[PDB]
Ligand binder design. Structure first.
Ligand SMILES: C[C@@H](O)[C@H](N)C(=O)N[C@H]1[C@@H](O)[C@H](n2cnc3c(N)ncnc32)O[C@@H]1CO
Ligand SMILES: C[C@@H](O)[C@H](N)C(=O)N[C@H]1[C@@H](O)[C@H](n2cnc3c(N)ncnc32)O[C@@H]1CO
Ligand SMILES: [Mg+2]
Ligand SMILES: [Mg+2]
Lengths: 136, 136
């Protein structure tokens, strides 16, 4: 799993065209205030240990940043060892679940299998943009 | 070299604190309309062949997208094989130069060695977000 942590002042996305033949999630849109936006690329090796490691780290970083909202934003472009779409959607659902056991704020999982527009206003402080890798 | 191509409706950034002890570029800020925003991570293997390959591809993609502005935005987080800061700043200056020989629109190289805030409004069309790797 490869993650990008973006500490945002605001974030919004809207699904546009379907990326996959049958996207497993419905279309939609959402917007937020201050949040940790977690661009998430699911990799071939990822299993339950990977998910839990990622859940704990996202929780800790969020604690350190004093954020109370985390967006899990599926993203295909952070690495060159992608899992297949079915496995990735399963891992992202598991990650959402795991995070809720470690982090007490709002967790929003953005829809999987869609092309999307988004806007972010990312903070410029020292810890506002960090990458993470998890494996098992 | 690892790149992320984001076809933006708008983009802006502002340098905030210095990331490096002595940033090789002055501080500043800029904003744009429709542009290809190229998040650029310079990797250990990168040399002149890498730069030219990247320049040609950025030019071609930009041609395909019908954009007339390209932002070269230094970014440390797209891979786990970073070049050192001196080499990276040199390669990014070379890339800027190379791109101007292949692409006829506005090329803006954002300042290197700074923490920055940014906002983007990324389009949601099929080709609006793509990753690229170049080597030699
Ligand atoms: C493209 C851009 O607008 C959008 N944001 C997008 O990237 N959409 C991705 C993810 O929602 C998802 N997806 C497929 N495989 C994976 C994977 N291994 N890991 C994470 N997501 C995946 O399916 C789409 C690409 O097939
Ligand atoms: C952090 C975030 O707010 C900001 N956008 C940032 O990433 N700043 C980076 C780049 O400007 C640059 N830098 C250092 N090494 C590299 C490299 N190998 N490739 C590209 N840039 C580099 O130096 C800063 C990190 O040392
Ligand atoms: Mg809609
Ligand atoms: Mg300023």
């Amino acid at each position: 799993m490869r993650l990008l942590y973006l500490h945002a002042d605001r974030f919004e996305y809207k699904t546009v065209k379907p990326a996959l033949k049958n996207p497993p999630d419905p279309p939609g849109e959402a917007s937020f205030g201050e949040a940790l936006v977690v661009f998430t690329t699911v990799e071939d090796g990822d299993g339950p240990q990977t998910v839990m490691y990622a859940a704990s780290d996202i929780a800790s970083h969020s604690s350190r940043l004093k954020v109370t909202t985390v967006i899990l934003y599926p993203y295909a472009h952070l690495s060159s060892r992608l899992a297949k779409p079915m496995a990735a959607h399963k891992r992202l659902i598991e990650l959402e679940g795991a995070l809720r056991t470690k982090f007490p704020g709002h967790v929003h999982r953005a829809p999987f299998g869609w092309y999307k527009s988004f806007s972010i206003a990312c903070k410029g402080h020292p810890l506002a943009e960090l990458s993470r890798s998890f494996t098992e």
